[PDB]
Point group: D2
């Protein structure tokens, strides 16, 4: 092809077709202004053409997938084998050979599309868990390419990873890259250990730094760089948007519609068993029972965005959460006044930002999360320095957002203590924490993340 | 004893101790003003004295029961064997011999207390399913007594009744009475058939009338009268109470607190799997999904009063209903505006009456109910002739309240159609139905019921 | 058509194609030798021709059904709505309007095939629950026809039947017949009461006799005869077959393969939740635990024939029974010697008969069964007068086989007592019972049943 | 006290009281012949005296525990918090603060008993997961003592360990020892990493060897040694016992009682969800369905010894396994001939050894196991060099028994392939593997293990 910079991801950065706002595609904008860039991904419609589509500063290469392909490669292998395994087997992974075989076939198809688009000596950046075979497949097809890979979800400990019948094929797949990145040093170090134990490769033994002090795996003639690059958001843009009059007006209206509570707790999550929504609800219920939260002036809003309905674990999870909601309101609410407001639906960006601005306490309590950008978005939105962030230790975000109220979500007593603390914090203490969190998030944004990964990758040449 | 009229019931008509208002004890007030009356029952506290307590127009004879007695006779046999069996095995009855043995022991203890209180030739009125052995036991102890029995729950068809390992002992128990009454002719006719089939007794073969045309079972020397007497409420008193200023003011306030909806649907039930609460919620959810009910101006309030928490079926039922509530609000509500308000708690009388007055549509959809007084209470409260009653055919009330919107709760399509019809009825049609329902309920009150049963019983002398 | 006697049933009396042995088609053989007979039914293959097929003493009229037709009319309405409802809602019926609509369509299609085959003034005999609309539909199409209907499953009490949203359509459907027959007077009497209550028809009020003392329903100009005709088997043929040398040799071999136990208990059932297989296993387990059955010389063989695998209730039931089997053997067996032998597969006729001959105790403990021919087959096979029959009261068979050891399957204590009694009966007592049972079964065979129904039907002319 | 060598373990090495044979107490016999030894542990009876009991070469110090103590410290914290967590959360750990508090109290009580028994400068060896706080508690009470700790179960990866609300207290507890040992280098390395990450201690960074190349944790003034010492059995004694005439005769009798199968597969396990019994049964069932195992000449015997019945996970597991057994026999067995023989009961040593000798294929397929001595016992018993060992990679045993047929139990396709391979191996290949396995197990016995740990501990002085 004629592209010297190519992004490979499960989906094209579009929706219907119009280019999707924000995210990775926006972070890379100034690079695309200096490169001949291309994006390889599934257009999100079944059995479509693979004809390249010129869309501004990108050429888009659509990967043809059937509904059956999506069911077995994505809904299957990716979301019901890899996802639960990598997230500390919160639910039991399903090991299915037909899913594996389709995952291989689809990965090869992404690899072929990438080669089709990539010019000689081009830099290629492959994204996430659904495409872990692509780097090896691409290097075999195109040994001239410089290949980076970034995993957006946790990389599990070796004791769990080893369950995968195709553990070696996945590992070799990743080792096809010149640079393998994770959010956290822990993931990088697990990968180094896996390389030694499973593949018998020689690796570096030192701790892995943040955006520095990289690890190495020796694979015959070449070296694989291994690093930690924690993702972030466009902090400055969110900070700007949350200041808009219409957003502030909507935040006031939200509080009014809730019957002007003294305190609003807020949860915002893609519905997933990794997110610890059940833990929040349990803690809230027990605090109400104990009279430690005032049922007359405190309300919990949980916004769950629909996710992966075709996967049974997610339907069962939705059932459990919805029971908790009904139960808590039946026990502690009044007619015309729930203590929990729960919505299961997509939330427009402007509405989400209004909720961040309205919320006195942000509850981000995942059991295991790669990063969790919601936590960072909340911080960026609170330029008024109001609010409080309650944050699980088991998110990548906790390594950076140490001034938040950190919790072990498995320690329910301390989750409860912490929610009371956040709800009753002095104005000054809340400001101290939020100022410190904002200093971190404003300085460590998605631009820094992307430049750091690309600088590390370029250095492998 | 020195009492010539004795009521026997599971519980004394008191609570703490102060005499409980309304109900059977109030209906019998003018009779107690002319008789030396007594009431035999468990005082509701474990291991208490059985010393007679003079309380105004009654002498109270407390029956001593241990917590273990209550667990096996009441929670066990009564509520987990007899209750589900008599209500068309909506859940599976548990047949347990230890429960049976305790049920026999406790019944004998009620019988002994009754004899202790009853003067020679006294009239005795035994109440309900928990005490079905008492009439036979009492006749053996005291053949001088005139004994009536009234079953407040349905009497099941013979095909189901026959499951009971102690079917014959229960039947003989009832046949100890001079008069056996049920709400409905159907129950009386089942009893007649059971007597012939199981006990081989000679009975009348004709249809049984309402408060007339009684059936007969020949038991050796004596005849057992069998009748249908549908219970009711103190219609005039409720009609009066619902007109009070404070009640009307509270009804307006309820509508205001719900965000002034155009239409309020109301369910009020003791939480029980017989009540068809799940059916209401399913119908409401599907109407919302279909856009046949407006989620912006219509709200459903369900008031569930706690019941029988020590029985697993009831805890499981509560879980299912609470899931439906959470689910429906998550799907169709807005923050600050649920489409379903659900409370699980006792409701004070004045509050309940305010809800009846506020409610545009009363949803009474049991799978199987002896009578259902909530339906009649709603009618009595609507002297403004507003509102609409949606009523299951499978309640005793449906035989009298034919002008309501009757439904087969198993026919979900028609339940849905009917809820739309009730919600959108013309003012005139609603008034026509409510006027007709009130004529019935005002004329057929608990006084008529009690006099009719007692006249039938007295006639057996 | 040219047929003056027509049988209508869900399936043709064939299999692949060769004519199926025994059953109704064999019972009617001497009638077919004097009539121009035809059989209407589904050939058991999807989307086949409806071309008449001359097969000896019958003309076969195949009804075309799609796999979707079978799924919704048969697997759906028939087996998941009607079957559980008619059998005392042992599992919850599913009420589904699409299933109903297909059931109507298919019934009409059977009606049209029947008219196609039937000559003027022909006698038509419609069979079973899957075809309850046919008599009315046929009378409308062909008012010249004489129509009989026989229900092979129980007819439920009115309190349960009334759940059916299409209760009236089913009842009108049956009332299209000149004669409606059931195994038992109880079913006939339920039908009479249903006719009065639901349809408001004038009926006879007397008890219904066995093959006599028929009931009547007046339907405008015409009268519907209602009767009880308990089905049976070809007793003499089974008696003859069980005497064959090869059968007796196989029975000895069975005992040898079981390690020559002193006592063999046997269950033989189509796998169904109506059959009470779980109750047998529970009783056996508790007797072993109590040391009341000797685990060293007593063995239980349960033969379950596969049934209705596409219906979830049946898969769940299979799971429960299979757990009980594993559990009991794990607790009381030895390596090389189970106390329970369980097979889930079809059993050839000759093998079944060998098991009847080998079995010391036949366990037939259904919760609810129309008749249960297995009980009668066992009796007919025991010309040696050995063995013992333990029989649920809730089978139609119990009305005739009173000399068996009758049990209420809900009374587990008495089921256990009875199994011990049957296992330890004196030789003389066992012979007394078996002689008496055989006298009944040899005299009341399928020939008597069929002649009695056809005589009653002919009499309606 | 007067003891210079003290073993601390959850239970005393006795049963009723007579001293229990084999195990750790027998391995230490020659050391006790040269030391003044004592054993601290719960005598296995509730609320007993703590009076020292002289029993030969040991003084026994009984720890008083109530039934409530056992319920919360052992059944609770140990078996329902720590056990599932350490075994890769195969089931969800329960985090309960009351259990934790009792675990602390009981550990302190073991510590106090130990100090009571231990002379100045005595060597103390604490055993297993139930007593992880003892080393720290003991060092505080008795800083003169030399303390070793050996964990008999896996030490989990840090990502899972960190879930424990009391993670730091457990880690500090272990760090109270002079020597911390695990079966495997993996456990030692997890512990080293945990020490750095959670406790911030300076550790060695190198790989940990087997019985060599020890790790170190620096804790202020002192160093903690960390090592891997894989436990084993008394190989020579088992080898001798399996040669006894009566054992060989019983093995022949077992095959005869199974109907002289060509091949016997054997599973022997304490019933536990870690053991992968469900996987064996699934593989066997699918091989039968596929016709890859001959249902006429191949049989599977599973011996499950009862374990932890008071823990719900274990009762649920038993239910699942027992269903599989019933199902497989129903599908593939014949009357008088199951394909699976399953016993749930304790098995006497001599009987177990006879089964090892009879078994053609030993199936040891745990999901996660510290070591698994059953695998080694089988090997030691096969001096005839017959048999085959199918062994999960996820057992500590797999690191030593590499010549067995190793499987990933999550890779069901390969488990199935491997069972066919083991069943059909040539005599020569089977002998080659068994000879090699025996060389390892005969040379690496429990004596070597115990001397190696004690030499390492002594070296810390």
């Amino acid at each position: 092809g004629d592209s010297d910079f190519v992004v490979v991801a499960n989906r094209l950065p579009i929706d219907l077709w119009k280019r999707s706002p924000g995210g990775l595609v926006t972070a890379l904008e100034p690079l695309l202004r200096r490169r001949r860039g291309a994006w390889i991904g599934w257009p999100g419609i079944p059995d479509s053409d693979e004809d390249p589509i010129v869309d501004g500063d990108l050429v888009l290469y659509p990967v043809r997938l059937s509904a059956d392909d999506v069911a077995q490669y994505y809904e299957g292998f990716s979301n019901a084998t890899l996802w639960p395994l990598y997230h500390d087997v919160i639910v039991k992974p399903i090991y299915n050979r037909q899913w594996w075989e389709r995952y291989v076939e689809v990965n090869r198809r992404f690899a072929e599309a990438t080669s089709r688009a990539a010019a000689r000596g081009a830099t290629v950046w492959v994204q996430d868990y659904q495409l872990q075979l692509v780097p090896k497949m691409l290097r075999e097809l195109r040994p001239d390419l410089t290949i980076g890979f970034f995993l957006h979800i946790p990389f599990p400990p070796v004791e769990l990873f080893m369950q995968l019948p195709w553990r070696t094929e996945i590992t070799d797949g990743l080792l096809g890259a010149d640079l393998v990145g994770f959010h956290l040093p822990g993931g990088a170090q697990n990968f180094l250990f896996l390389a030694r134990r499973l593949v018998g490769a020689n690796t570096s033994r030192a701790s892995v730094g943040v955006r520095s002090k990289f690890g190495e795996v020796q694979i015959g003639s070449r070296t694989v760089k291994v690093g930690a690059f924690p993702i972030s958001i466009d902090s400055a843009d969110l900070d700007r948007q949350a200041r808009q009059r219409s957003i502030r007006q909507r935040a006031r209206q939200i509080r009014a519609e809730l019957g002007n509570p003294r305190r609003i707790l807020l949860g915002v999550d893609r519905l997933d068993y990794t997110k610890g929504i059940d833990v929040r609800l349990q803690a809230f219920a027990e605090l109400l029972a104990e009279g430690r939260v005032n049922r007359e002036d405190t309300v919990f809003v949980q916004l769950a965005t629909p996710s992966r309905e075709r996967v049974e674990a997610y339907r069962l999870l939705r059932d459990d959460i919805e029971r908790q909601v009904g139960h808590i309101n039946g026990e502690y609410g009044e007619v015309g006044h729930p203590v929990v407001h729960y919505l299961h639906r997509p939330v427009p960006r402007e509405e989400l930002i209004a909720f961040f601005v309205a919320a006195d306490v942000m509850l981000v309590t995942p059991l295991r999360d790669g990063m969790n950008l919601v936590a960072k978005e909340y911080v960026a939105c609170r330029s008024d320095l109001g609010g409080a962030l309650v944050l699980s230790e088991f998110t990548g975000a906790a390594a950076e957002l140490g001034q938040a109220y950190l919790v072990n979500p498995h320690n329910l007593d301390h989750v409860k203590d912490t929610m009371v603390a956040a709800l009753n914090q002095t104005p000054e203490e809340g400001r101290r924490r939020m100022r410190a969190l904002r200093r971190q998030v404003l300085a460590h944004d998605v631009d820094l993340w992307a430049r750091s990964f690309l600088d590390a990758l370029a250095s492998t040449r």
